[PDB]
Amino acid sequence: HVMSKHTDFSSEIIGYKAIDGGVTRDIASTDTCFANKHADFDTWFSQRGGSYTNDKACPLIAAVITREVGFVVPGLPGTILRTTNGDFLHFLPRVFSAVGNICYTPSKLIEYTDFATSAC
Amino acid sequence: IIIWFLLLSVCLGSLIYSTAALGVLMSNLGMPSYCTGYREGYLNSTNVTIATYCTGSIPCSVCLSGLDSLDTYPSLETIQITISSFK
Amino acid sequence: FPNTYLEGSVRVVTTFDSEYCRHGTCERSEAGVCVSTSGRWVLNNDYYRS
């Protein structure tokens, strides 16, 4: 199987986030390889002067969306949606605009900048 | 004795390969064929993994070869690590 | 995860003589009480004490 690019729900996306090691993290320009399912991410990354190579052994790209899309699967961050062609997609829904990447404590939800140095 | 069982296994594998080739011909030219039911059911199903849908059955997995699945991502795993102990 | 009494910008935690583990990382700590000025992860050992 070879990954393909899709442009559905493009107008509902504010930005993109990266998932590494099962935990979402911010994206830096120095990263060189990703797994991508979107075509607008090329314009998102090129405007910042970055280039990358597509491979399955690299962190996935997920789009921050303002619309409730997909369904929740236990153990997986965000939501999962499957395209009409069988390809799966990942999104980060939110309730309020001031949301980055949120992790779960046993009692409350707190945002974080780095998983290794947070109460996550 | 063992040779008969080996030949039976080879023939079963050849039949499975023939079914896979029929599925490939279906994906190329249509097609109403043997593997239609499994893929049609799996596309509309909410099972993101093939293990829960096919329940480990060989023909169901063979018919589903070539489609995207959640199991294909190795980056989603998280190996448990024990930190350094002391000085 | 250990018991806590305050969460937010400042945290206070209590520990026992047993190892605690979180998502993908298990660590060993000794019994005691720790106070942090930031919401970072805290455990009772020499590494965090430094």
From Swiss-Prot, chain A:
Job of this protein: Plays a role in the formation and maintenance of double membrane vesicles (DMVs) replication organelles. DMVs are formed by nsp3 and nsp4, while nsp6 zippers ER membranes and connects to lipid droplets.
Protein name, entry field: Non-structural protein 4
Membrane topology category: Multi-pass membrane protein
Known partners and oligomeric status: Interacts with PL-PRO and nsp6.
This protein's encoding gene: rep
Species assigned in the record: Severe acute respiratory syndrome coronavirus 2
Subcellular location as annotated: Host endoplasmic reticulum membrane
Curated annotation (Swiss-Prot), chain C:
UniProt membrane topology term: Multi-pass membrane protein
Subcellular localization, as worded in the UniProt entry: Host endoplasmic reticulum membrane
Effect listed in the UniProt record for changing D17N: In strain: Theta/P.3
Top-rank taxon: Viruses
Function text: Plays a role in the formation and maintenance of double membrane vesicles (DMVs) replication organelles. DMVs are formed by nsp3 and nsp4, while nsp6 zippers ER membranes and connects to lipid droplets.
Record note on quaternary structure: Interacts with PL-PRO and nsp6.
Protein name as annotated: Non-structural protein 4
Originating organism: Severe acute respiratory syndrome coronavirus 2
Taxonomic path: Viruses, Riboviria, Orthornavirae, Pisuviricota, Pisoniviricetes
